[PDB]
Amino acid sequence: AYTTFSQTKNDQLKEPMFFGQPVNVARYDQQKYDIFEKLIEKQLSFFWRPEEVDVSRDRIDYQALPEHEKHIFISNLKYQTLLDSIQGRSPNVALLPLISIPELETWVETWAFSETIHSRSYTHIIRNIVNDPSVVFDDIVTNEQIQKRAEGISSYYDELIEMTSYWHLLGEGTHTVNGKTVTVSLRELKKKLYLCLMSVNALEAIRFYVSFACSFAFAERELMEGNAKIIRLIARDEALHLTGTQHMLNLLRSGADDPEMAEIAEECKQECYDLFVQAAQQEKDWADYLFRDGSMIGLNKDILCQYVEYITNIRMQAVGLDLPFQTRSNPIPWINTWLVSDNVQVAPQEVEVSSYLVGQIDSEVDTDDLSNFQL
Amino acid sequence: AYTTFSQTKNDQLKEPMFFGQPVNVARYDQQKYDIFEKLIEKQLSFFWRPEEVDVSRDRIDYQALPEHEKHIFISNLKYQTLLDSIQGRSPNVALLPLISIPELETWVETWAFSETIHSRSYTHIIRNIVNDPSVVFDDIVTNEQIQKRAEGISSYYDELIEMTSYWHLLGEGTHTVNGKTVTVSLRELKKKLYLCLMSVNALEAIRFYVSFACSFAFAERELMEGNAKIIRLIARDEALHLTGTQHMLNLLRSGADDPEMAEIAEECKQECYDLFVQAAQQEKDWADYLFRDGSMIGLNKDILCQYVEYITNIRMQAVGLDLPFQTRSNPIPWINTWLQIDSEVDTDDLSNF
Amino acid sequence: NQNLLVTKRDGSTERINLDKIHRVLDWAAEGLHNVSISQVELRSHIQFYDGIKTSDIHETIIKAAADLISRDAPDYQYLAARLAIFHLRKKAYGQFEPPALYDHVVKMVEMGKYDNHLLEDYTEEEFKQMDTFIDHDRDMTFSYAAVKQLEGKYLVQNRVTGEIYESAQFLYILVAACLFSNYPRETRLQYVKRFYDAVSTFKISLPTPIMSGVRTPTRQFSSCVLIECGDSLDSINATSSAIVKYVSQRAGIGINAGRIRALGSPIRGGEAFHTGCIPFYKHFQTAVKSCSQGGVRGGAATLFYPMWHLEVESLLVLKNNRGVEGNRVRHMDYGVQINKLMYTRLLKGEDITLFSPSDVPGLYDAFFADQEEFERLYTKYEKDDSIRKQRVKAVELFSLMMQERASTGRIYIQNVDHCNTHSPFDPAIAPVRQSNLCLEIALPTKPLNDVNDENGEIALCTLSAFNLGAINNLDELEELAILAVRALDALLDYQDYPIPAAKRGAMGRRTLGIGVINFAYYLAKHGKRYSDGSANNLTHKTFEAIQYYLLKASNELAKEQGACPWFNETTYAKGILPIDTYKKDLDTIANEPLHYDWEALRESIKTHGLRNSTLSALMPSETSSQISNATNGIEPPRGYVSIKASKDGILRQVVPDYEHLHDAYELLWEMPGNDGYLQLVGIMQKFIDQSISANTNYDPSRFPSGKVPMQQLLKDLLTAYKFGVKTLYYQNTRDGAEDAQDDL
Amino acid sequence: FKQMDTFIDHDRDMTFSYAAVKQLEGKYLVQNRVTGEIYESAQFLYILVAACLFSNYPRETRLQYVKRFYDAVSTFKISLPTPIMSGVRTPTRQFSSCVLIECGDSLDSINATSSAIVKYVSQRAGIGINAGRIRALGSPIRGGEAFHTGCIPFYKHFQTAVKSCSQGGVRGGAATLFYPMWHLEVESLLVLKNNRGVEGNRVRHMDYGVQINKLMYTRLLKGEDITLFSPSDVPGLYDAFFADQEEFERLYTK
Ligand SMILES: Nc1ncnc2c1ncn2[C@@H]1O[C@H](COP(=O)(O)OP(=O)(O)OP(=O)(O)O)[C@@H](O)[C@H]1O
Ligand SMILES: Nc1ncnc2c1ncn2[C@@H]1O[C@H](COP(=O)(O)OP(=O)(O)OP(=O)(O)O)[C@@H](O)[C@H]1O
Ligand SMILES: Nc1ncnc2c1ncn2[C@H]1C[C@H](O)[C@@H](COP(=O)(O)OP(=O)(O)OP(=O)(O)O)O1
Ligand SMILES: Nc1ncnc2c1ncn2[C@H]1C[C@H](O)[C@@H](COP(=O)(O)OP(=O)(O)OP(=O)(O)O)O1
Ligand SMILES: *N[C@@]1(O)C[C@H](n2ccc(N)nc2=O)O[C@@H]1COP(=O)(O)OP(=O)(O)O
Ligand SMILES: [Mg+2]
Ligand SMILES: [Mg+2]
């Protein structure tokens, strides 16, 4: 049975990441894996709110758009809103009752909070650019393409939650529920957990980035720059989320946490693959749905499909998977100006700056060293 | 069965607070209860990090303290660390698979994140005031005088989670598992959720404020100023969380959200009161344990017990419960310096004028 | 082919023809190296559909060329530029060859695009001669960012229909002809030709108001406006009206609002009580954001207040993203004013006392005028128990200020004592109490009681810059400065003033700000860097030459055309030179002797005077440097191929002379820290009449804990004070966000 | 003064009610706002208001007029606003209330309107602004020299002017803004007060008044379409919207 606080004094530097003793005391002075500590620190320093970006010009630029471009922008915003609404609640339910180290638990909670901020920001953009947002938010759960591009994540989450509840409630073995035989296997639970993590990786690493490219193409045409700043701030945290999922998957494949997980993942060099191929195909369908009434300068169906294949290859190489597409280059190199902020110098008196950290100061002041200072 | 994304486009403005259709999309332009949106906005407007507070002098101040004051400080820090280590994860696990309005879901997520920030701040203080933070963190679990409260607090969460799992797995009715009969009832699960929410309200309303008083009494002595600076922000966030859970309990009790939870609240008039008085007694006994081998200049067993009784009276009136102690003013005033339209149009207007 | 059909500009429909696109690309590719037309065609043809407009084809090829700008093939920066030129000409005249200058001027004046006076002050023959001066081939020397800024910001255009009316050479020649319109007919055209050759060849850089409004019938070109707000409702209303009137006319605003009494302060002896400065700050913000800067960009303003203000803790956090609407004003920048006393209180670990400015008579005036009186009054008032005050820890206040400056990057510093002791103006008569939006302008101001009050004084500064990357010798600054000064001075007699107080200030002081651009390119060409301190002597010599030649030009202009009307209020009138009042600590880091005869200049200034009160001020040149493809101001470039982002585009800019000088460049995030840059800034401030837009840059990955230490921030602040740095501009931070998507 | 004293009837003080007396103490009778002690009774207030109002009257009929007005007011037959009762007979001369300010389609007019709003809210006076003449978003400025960013930024400026002297940012500032129904931005102006929008596109602390005439009502009755124009693009339509209905109909049709 799951317990919020476990009365056994375990050593948390020797516990597995998942399927161990549930965490009791939240400590941050020592981590089994420091990568999650760094991710939490970076996410905290990356704090932001949509209210800090002036979006007055975004209304004017949106109302002057042709119908087809408005359709593209609003469809990407609606999909992102729904998926980040899902991503706000899903880690806390699927992953929290399975995590057995404090660092991963805190990272999952911080990641969920970041997704709530992202959903608020998408809603903020929609409220700003649309004079009646009720007509837009109501066409989200009923949109056919949005549903077709979203079930392949909630399904895996639901399966993981279902058999996690079964495991926490019955234990390993064969049991009889209402006369039906239910088998609870920790191997199957580990397999579902790996599959769900691989689905979340695919989502946050490919689908959200396709939507990001769609939103950034408008800013490349000197249109809707404040929404672009908001989306760039979102992508800044999305990089951290995909890095965290990638590390979670790679630590379960090398066997450094559980020797069984390595062979379980080896039994998934087709399933995990098939899932990524299906996600790429779903993105191709989404790209066809976006550019149905027309295309836009710098972005059409062919370019977005090429980018889908490129990013799928790039993010599948990072999790030890074969490349399902031709090894090519980036068809839209300008996206690199929206995800790498090292050489980006924005005009601060015209547009907002997206390169600020919150509370990244050591705060230690020694008055003795400052006293010996001649002004 | 719980689903992360429910395909039915329900009207979230008429859904119940809990036990309705699981939330699918988050709405910020409209809320059934705006209080949770205001709470989320206030929490985001109070965002802080432990690294923004200088705690360099805290080590020197702690090293110069007498043994019995050091004991009080470290026991208070251990209690706060355990309480917020629980409160970090517990709302995200117990309440998330039960909420059916987006605003409450978002508030619960933000509240859990803020509790994680509190835990990080406690770790920061412990690491900055003690040579090795192990002799405190590994002592938190085995400390006899804290584990009883740990069980008493986590039991409600665990029972709520277990019943929620049976409800989501089997549904309402009588079922047979491994030859034993399990009765899953929505009334029983509602009672469990109400009891858990009352336990959370007692935790963030009473248990944390005693420790706040112990931490602030050092501040009134111009000692451990960085610790006090951190605890001030923690207390602000606590007040926010307490307001949130108080609103949750009041809206469940009023019956304006669920015509069945009113009866459950009425039948908890003895169990909820027992839980609150048990929490007050536990804080009084914790105060007893704090000042055993000595006492502090501005804090002792007597005045701290009076403060516990005062704070629990005030926080028990707020959730519609009979006061269990005599009315008495605040014995430590210095702590107050540290805390629906149908849109249809016919063609009969042509024949108006 | 794919049997595709395009929509022509005249509305007709034609068949696809890739040969025309290839011909245009080859036209834009003349003389370029490592540029392939094939790649541009490959990235452009995939985006061609049925019924595509030819204008969209041009935009597609321009964008495809611009996306190829990189360190391996920097020459694309020209191919994407000429293409963008090709489109502008067709958008301006319907053809490539521009018309005759006289016909263009007449046609533009008819429809009201240009000022009528151009047709009155010049005859047809003079217009033909200026047409002879013109060389449109210079349009091929622009970079992609330069052309994008010209198209989106500077070229005369309809802001509603998007139609462009002129090219860049017409812009330059008409600015030159319109500045020197009133000059004697004998030497007028020679000055016009010399100024046009200076600007078109990128020797002198002009700011946005001048580059976008000199030929236009709206005649206001002061880049910087300084308005002082008084502790009065009438003063607040006048400040709001002046802000609205001047933002709409191509001007940024620096509001000094440190005189407004604190929250809770009595009004009229107790009849009413003040509600705080926050609602008035919100009023100022809405005044700034109501209009645009002449239909070019959004308005911006900076608020100034002393550090000892009673509400300083509330004002410090006004910018961060961690508040609500009732306690945050996030769309205006802020400047904290500090003197030696606050720094000493921080050093000694004592307390800082905050008063309401209305409750301490004389403290606010002595804050800027003289510091002995300020210390006496501050000490007196700290021991007075009948004055409302609040005591805070100096380390706590400074920590809060640096926390906010790090988190928002836009909490600027002004050392008021340095702004007055090392000032061209006399603190007793004309003290400096504030700065401009970008913290480079330091001019006297007087509060206004009415938008038409004549007792007030609003400071106006018109700017220009020297391209240090276009001068081969410092002596070349002799002529250019003259031109610059002359042009700017003529602009002062050409401009119109909506607020009479601004006219009073501009005609009394005649202040100009001439800065530099391409300083990083200059250092790299000389083989020096910011960090090691090798550039100290070179910076000393360069800025000594700049200040000497600016002063000489102003002195000649004064002895030819009369001295400045309020020249008696400046320290120059008493023989005091910038080489006299500089901070002495600068002697410990620079050993370079003066090369020019400053004694003869001092005697000449005493005898005749300066036409202008101020001449030097180092602006950031965020937008104007892009025209000449120059590093902005004195800031090192962030990358070899940097990205300039604005509402007018995301543009890839290559550092000048990247092929032969990439190893000699020092990029911003390759700097050990801030010591060398601050030393260079102090050496500059030794000679500059006004402040310098000096940035502080911190990368938290350069420290062991991954966090910038508060000790380092305070040490850098104290170091900047020690070397005489008047003001600190943006604090830039390396967030470390990197999700690289390069080829596999 | 002796004649007024014999005109005074202090028995009328016993005709007030408890809420009346509480309001009288709170805002009517002169008092010290620090010590909280009062100095005058109701009858003195009434008689002195009557005397001060009729001070510049001929001395043949001044006393009888004062007596009649005092009898009318003290009997509760004529009622006068709270500022009159709190200011008349006192050294102040600010007898505030509500002010109607019209704003033209000019920057000078906008500045003057904002200054007047600031000067009148500080006297705790309600504001009625007519900002319906401001041209719509996207209208040319100076023949295309600038792009108009709409009425919303100026409405926000007016709102901050109203709240400039308000405690806590937004507390006792009250204003009502008027615009015609046929304004080109009317769809974006009608939703200025609901929470469905962001702060950048919402002005929630000011009330709004939509101006309608016969043509809009008859188009609603017939189910036709209402056409919205920028007031600067239709010469004479804004003037005819109030003055001449037949002329407005002709211009609207044209
Ligand atoms: N028939 C065509 N097929 C393909 N591209 C064309 C064709 N005609 C013009 N273009 C391209 O369209 C771009 C823009 O051309 P341009 O600005 O001259 O407008 P236009 O439609 O050609 O009208 P016009 O030249 O008569 O003024 C050019 O780069 C040009 O190469
Ligand atoms: N001699 C030139 N050098 C550089 N660019 C040119 C030149 N002539 C035209 N251009 C540019 O090339 C584009 C098209 O030129 P042009 O109108 O002559 O041919 P086109 O429009 O492509 O085909 P068509 O002759 O059918 O109209 C325009 O943007 C135009 O400004
Ligand atoms: N009613 C008000 N509420 C809040 N602030 C006000 C009010 N009236 C004026 N202020 C502000 C405006 C100024 O910043 C400051 C000073 O008041 P002011 O405009 O000078 O009128 P005043 O001259 O009659 O009073 P004082 O003699 O005290 O300066 O107080
Ligand atoms: N720079 C600006 N940005 C946004 N709006 C502006 C700007 N300048 C003026 N406006 C608004 C204010 C008025 O509502 C409207 C007309 O302004 P106005 O002050 O009368 O200028 P103007 O007379 O020089 O040009 P016009 O004749 O077109 O009005 O446009
Ligand atoms: N006087 C100023 O400091 C402020 C003002 N300004 C600059 C940039 C923006 N977006 N708005 C403004 O109002 O101009 C000068 C600053 O000088 P520069 O920034 O260097 O001039 P320029 O690059 O715009 O041409
Ligand atoms: Mg006054
Ligand atoms: Mg006008």
PDB file of N, CA and C in Angstrom, chain A residues 373-375, chain C residues 337-344 346-347 367 371 375 398 413-421 582-586 678-679 681-682 685 694 696 713-728:
ATOM      1  N   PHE A 373      37.996  48.878   1.449  1.00  0.00           N
ATOM      2  CA  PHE A 373      37.768  49.311   0.074  1.00  0.00           C
ATOM      3  C   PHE A 373      37.775  50.830   0.047  1.00  0.00           C
ATOM      4  N   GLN A 374      38.649  51.406  -0.773  1.00  0.00           N
ATOM      5  CA  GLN A 374      38.777  52.852  -0.889  1.00  0.00           C
ATOM      6  C   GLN A 374      37.930  53.334  -2.060  1.00  0.00           C
ATOM      7  N   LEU A 375      36.978  54.215  -1.776  1.00  0.00           N
ATOM      8  CA  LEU A 375      36.116  54.770  -2.812  1.00  0.00           C
ATOM      9  C   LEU A 375      36.827  55.887  -3.566  1.00  0.00           C
TER      10      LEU A 375
ATOM     11  N   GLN C 337      19.297  56.532  -7.481  1.00  0.00           N
ATOM     12  CA  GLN C 337      20.324  57.554  -7.339  1.00  0.00           C
ATOM     13  C   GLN C 337      21.032  57.375  -6.002  1.00  0.00           C
ATOM     14  N   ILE C 338      22.356  57.245  -6.049  1.00  0.00           N
ATOM     15  CA  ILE C 338      23.177  56.957  -4.879  1.00  0.00           C
ATOM     16  C   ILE C 338      24.367  57.906  -4.871  1.00  0.00           C
ATOM     17  N   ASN C 339      24.766  58.351  -3.684  1.00  0.00           N
ATOM     18  CA  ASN C 339      25.965  59.166  -3.522  1.00  0.00           C
ATOM     19  C   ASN C 339      26.970  58.437  -2.631  1.00  0.00           C
ATOM     20  N   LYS C 340      28.047  59.144  -2.278  1.00  0.00           N
ATOM     21  CA  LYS C 340      29.118  58.546  -1.486  1.00  0.00           C
ATOM     22  C   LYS C 340      28.636  58.108  -0.110  1.00  0.00           C
ATOM     23  N   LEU C 341      27.673  58.829   0.466  1.00  0.00           N
ATOM     24  CA  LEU C 341      27.232  58.525   1.823  1.00  0.00           C
ATOM     25  C   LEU C 341      26.631  57.128   1.918  1.00  0.00           C
ATOM     26  N   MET C 342      25.778  56.759   0.960  1.00  0.00           N
ATOM     27  CA  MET C 342      25.169  55.432   0.987  1.00  0.00           C
ATOM     28  C   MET C 342      26.217  54.338   0.836  1.00  0.00           C
ATOM     29  N   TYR C 343      27.193  54.546  -0.051  1.00  0.00           N
ATOM     30  CA  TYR C 343      28.260  53.566  -0.213  1.00  0.00           C
ATOM     31  C   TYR C 343      29.073  53.421   1.066  1.00  0.00           C
ATOM     32  N   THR C 344      29.341  54.535   1.755  1.00  0.00           N
ATOM     33  CA  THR C 344      30.066  54.462   3.020  1.00  0.00           C
ATOM     34  C   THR C 344      29.257  53.723   4.079  1.00  0.00           C
ATOM     35  N   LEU C 346      27.129  51.370   3.480  1.00  0.00           N
ATOM     36  CA  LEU C 346      27.246  49.959   3.118  1.00  0.00           C
ATOM     37  C   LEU C 346      28.593  49.388   3.539  1.00  0.00           C
ATOM     38  N   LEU C 347      29.673  50.141   3.319  1.00  0.00           N
ATOM     39  CA  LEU C 347      31.008  49.652   3.650  1.00  0.00           C
ATOM     40  C   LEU C 347      31.180  49.458   5.151  1.00  0.00           C
ATOM     41  N   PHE C 367      21.323  66.723  -2.163  1.00  0.00           N
ATOM     42  CA  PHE C 367      21.670  65.392  -2.645  1.00  0.00           C
ATOM     43  C   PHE C 367      22.508  65.467  -3.911  1.00  0.00           C
ATOM     44  N   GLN C 371      27.929  67.741  -1.459  1.00  0.00           N
ATOM     45  CA  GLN C 371      27.782  66.607  -0.558  1.00  0.00           C
ATOM     46  C   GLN C 371      28.137  66.919   0.888  1.00  0.00           C
ATOM     47  N   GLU C 375      25.631  65.758   3.736  1.00  0.00           N
ATOM     48  CA  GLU C 375      26.017  65.004   4.923  1.00  0.00           C
ATOM     49  C   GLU C 375      25.562  65.710   6.191  1.00  0.00           C
ATOM     50  N   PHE C 398      21.014  47.379  -0.251  1.00  0.00           N
ATOM     51  CA  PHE C 398      21.838  47.125  -1.428  1.00  0.00           C
ATOM     52  C   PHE C 398      21.612  45.719  -1.969  1.00  0.00           C
ATOM     53  N   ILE C 413      21.688  52.355 -12.098  1.00  0.00           N
ATOM     54  CA  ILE C 413      22.322  53.095 -11.017  1.00  0.00           C
ATOM     55  C   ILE C 413      22.788  54.436 -11.560  1.00  0.00           C
ATOM     56  N   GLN C 414      22.636  55.485 -10.755  1.00  0.00           N
ATOM     57  CA  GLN C 414      23.201  56.793 -11.061  1.00  0.00           C
ATOM     58  C   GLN C 414      23.931  57.308  -9.832  1.00  0.00           C
ATOM     59  N   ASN C 415      25.239  57.511  -9.965  1.00  0.00           N
ATOM     60  CA  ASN C 415      26.047  58.112  -8.909  1.00  0.00           C
ATOM     61  C   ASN C 415      25.935  59.622  -9.050  1.00  0.00           C
ATOM     62  N   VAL C 416      25.066  60.222  -8.238  1.00  0.00           N
ATOM     63  CA  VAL C 416      24.721  61.627  -8.416  1.00  0.00           C
ATOM     64  C   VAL C 416      25.903  62.536  -8.106  1.00  0.00           C
ATOM     65  N   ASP C 417      26.741  62.162  -7.138  1.00  0.00           N
ATOM     66  CA  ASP C 417      27.912  62.976  -6.833  1.00  0.00           C
ATOM     67  C   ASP C 417      28.863  63.041  -8.022  1.00  0.00           C
ATOM     68  N   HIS C 418      29.095  61.908  -8.689  1.00  0.00           N
ATOM     69  CA  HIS C 418      29.953  61.913  -9.869  1.00  0.00           C
ATOM     70  C   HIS C 418      29.322  62.689 -11.016  1.00  0.00           C
ATOM     71  N   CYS C 419      27.993  62.685 -11.104  1.00  0.00           N
ATOM     72  CA  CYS C 419      27.292  63.384 -12.172  1.00  0.00           C
ATOM     73  C   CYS C 419      27.357  64.899 -12.032  1.00  0.00           C
ATOM     74  N   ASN C 420      27.820  65.412 -10.896  1.00  0.00           N
ATOM     75  CA  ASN C 420      27.856  66.849 -10.652  1.00  0.00           C
ATOM     76  C   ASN C 420      29.260  67.400 -10.471  1.00  0.00           C
ATOM     77  N   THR C 421      30.132  66.695  -9.747  1.00  0.00           N
ATOM     78  CA  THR C 421      31.509  67.159  -9.614  1.00  0.00           C
ATOM     79  C   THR C 421      32.245  67.096 -10.947  1.00  0.00           C
ATOM     80  N   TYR C 582      38.249  65.069 -13.328  1.00  0.00           N
ATOM     81  CA  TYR C 582      38.111  63.622 -13.362  1.00  0.00           C
ATOM     82  C   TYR C 582      38.581  63.004 -12.047  1.00  0.00           C
ATOM     83  N   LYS C 583      38.076  61.804 -11.769  1.00  0.00           N
ATOM     84  CA  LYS C 583      38.438  61.099 -10.545  1.00  0.00           C
ATOM     85  C   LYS C 583      39.909  60.704 -10.578  1.00  0.00           C
ATOM     86  N   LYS C 584      40.615  60.958  -9.474  1.00  0.00           N
ATOM     87  CA  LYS C 584      42.057  60.745  -9.442  1.00  0.00           C
ATOM     88  C   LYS C 584      42.439  59.271  -9.439  1.00  0.00           C
ATOM     89  N   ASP C 585      41.543  58.382  -9.001  1.00  0.00           N
ATOM     90  CA  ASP C 585      41.846  56.955  -9.031  1.00  0.00           C
ATOM     91  C   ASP C 585      42.142  56.473 -10.444  1.00  0.00           C
ATOM     92  N   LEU C 586      41.623  57.172 -11.455  1.00  0.00           N
ATOM     93  CA  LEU C 586      41.905  56.826 -12.841  1.00  0.00           C
ATOM     94  C   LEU C 586      43.389  56.885 -13.159  1.00  0.00           C
ATOM     95  N   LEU C 678      34.834  47.941 -16.850  1.00  0.00           N
ATOM     96  CA  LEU C 678      34.569  49.096 -15.997  1.00  0.00           C
ATOM     97  C   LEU C 678      35.741  50.069 -15.998  1.00  0.00           C
ATOM     98  N   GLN C 679      36.973  49.555 -16.055  1.00  0.00           N
ATOM     99  CA  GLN C 679      38.131  50.437 -16.162  1.00  0.00           C
ATOM    100  C   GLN C 679      38.103  51.223 -17.468  1.00  0.00           C
ATOM    101  N   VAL C 681      35.415  51.985 -19.128  1.00  0.00           N
ATOM    102  CA  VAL C 681      34.312  52.934 -19.010  1.00  0.00           C
ATOM    103  C   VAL C 681      34.734  54.150 -18.195  1.00  0.00           C
ATOM    104  N   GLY C 682      35.479  53.932 -17.111  1.00  0.00           N
ATOM    105  CA  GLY C 682      35.981  55.056 -16.336  1.00  0.00           C
ATOM    106  C   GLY C 682      36.943  55.925 -17.123  1.00  0.00           C
ATOM    107  N   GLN C 685      34.877  58.004 -19.282  1.00  0.00           N
ATOM    108  CA  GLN C 685      34.182  59.023 -18.505  1.00  0.00           C
ATOM    109  C   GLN C 685      35.105  60.157 -18.090  1.00  0.00           C
ATOM    110  N   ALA C 694      26.806  52.089 -19.668  1.00  0.00           N
ATOM    111  CA  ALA C 694      27.716  51.016 -19.292  1.00  0.00           C
ATOM    112  C   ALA C 694      26.931  49.815 -18.780  1.00  0.00           C
ATOM    113  N   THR C 696      26.760  45.837 -17.181  1.00  0.00           N
ATOM    114  CA  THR C 696      27.424  44.822 -16.374  1.00  0.00           C
ATOM    115  C   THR C 696      26.878  43.460 -16.776  1.00  0.00           C
ATOM    116  N   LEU C 713      28.691  41.255  -7.040  1.00  0.00           N
ATOM    117  CA  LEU C 713      27.867  42.354  -7.534  1.00  0.00           C
ATOM    118  C   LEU C 713      28.173  43.647  -6.788  1.00  0.00           C
ATOM    119  N   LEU C 714      28.237  43.575  -5.456  1.00  0.00           N
ATOM    120  CA  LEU C 714      28.539  44.769  -4.673  1.00  0.00           C
ATOM    121  C   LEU C 714      29.950  45.272  -4.954  1.00  0.00           C
ATOM    122  N   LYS C 715      30.904  44.357  -5.135  1.00  0.00           N
ATOM    123  CA  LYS C 715      32.271  44.757  -5.446  1.00  0.00           C
ATOM    124  C   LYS C 715      32.347  45.455  -6.795  1.00  0.00           C
ATOM    125  N   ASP C 716      31.611  44.956  -7.790  1.00  0.00           N
ATOM    126  CA  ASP C 716      31.601  45.610  -9.094  1.00  0.00           C
ATOM    127  C   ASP C 716      30.939  46.981  -9.019  1.00  0.00           C
ATOM    128  N   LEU C 717      29.864  47.105  -8.235  1.00  0.00           N
ATOM    129  CA  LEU C 717      29.234  48.410  -8.042  1.00  0.00           C
ATOM    130  C   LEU C 717      30.208  49.400  -7.410  1.00  0.00           C
ATOM    131  N   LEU C 718      30.909  48.964  -6.360  1.00  0.00           N
ATOM    132  CA  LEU C 718      31.876  49.831  -5.696  1.00  0.00           C
ATOM    133  C   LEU C 718      33.045  50.167  -6.612  1.00  0.00           C
ATOM    134  N   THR C 719      33.479  49.210  -7.435  1.00  0.00           N
ATOM    135  CA  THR C 719      34.561  49.461  -8.382  1.00  0.00           C
ATOM    136  C   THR C 719      34.147  50.486  -9.427  1.00  0.00           C
ATOM    137  N   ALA C 720      32.913  50.383  -9.923  1.00  0.00           N
ATOM    138  CA  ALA C 720      32.412  51.378 -10.860  1.00  0.00           C
ATOM    139  C   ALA C 720      32.359  52.754 -10.217  1.00  0.00           C
ATOM    140  N   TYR C 721      31.932  52.830  -8.953  1.00  0.00           N
ATOM    141  CA  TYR C 721      31.955  54.116  -8.264  1.00  0.00           C
ATOM    142  C   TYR C 721      33.380  54.638  -8.107  1.00  0.00           C
ATOM    143  N   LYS C 722      34.329  53.748  -7.810  1.00  0.00           N
ATOM    144  CA  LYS C 722      35.692  54.168  -7.504  1.00  0.00           C
ATOM    145  C   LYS C 722      36.386  54.782  -8.713  1.00  0.00           C
ATOM    146  N   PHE C 723      36.068  54.314  -9.916  1.00  0.00           N
ATOM    147  CA  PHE C 723      36.695  54.807 -11.133  1.00  0.00           C
ATOM    148  C   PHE C 723      35.922  55.950 -11.777  1.00  0.00           C
ATOM    149  N   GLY C 724      34.882  56.454 -11.121  1.00  0.00           N
ATOM    150  CA  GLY C 724      34.156  57.599 -11.625  1.00  0.00           C
ATOM    151  C   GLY C 724      33.044  57.294 -12.599  1.00  0.00           C
ATOM    152  N   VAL C 725      32.575  56.049 -12.659  1.00  0.00           N
ATOM    153  CA  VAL C 725      31.469  55.705 -13.544  1.00  0.00           C
ATOM    154  C   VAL C 725      30.201  56.362 -13.018  1.00  0.00           C
ATOM    155  N   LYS C 726      29.578  57.199 -13.851  1.00  0.00           N
ATOM    156  CA  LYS C 726      28.402  57.944 -13.412  1.00  0.00           C
ATOM    157  C   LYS C 726      27.170  57.055 -13.319  1.00  0.00           C
ATOM    158  N   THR C 727      26.942  56.212 -14.322  1.00  0.00           N
ATOM    159  CA  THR C 727      25.717  55.437 -14.400  1.00  0.00           C
ATOM    160  C   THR C 727      26.012  54.018 -14.860  1.00  0.00           C
ATOM    161  N   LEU C 728      25.137  53.091 -14.472  1.00  0.00           N
ATOM    162  CA  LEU C 728      25.192  51.708 -14.928  1.00  0.00           C
ATOM    163  C   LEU C 728      23.917  51.377 -15.685  1.00  0.00           C
TER     164      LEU C 728
END
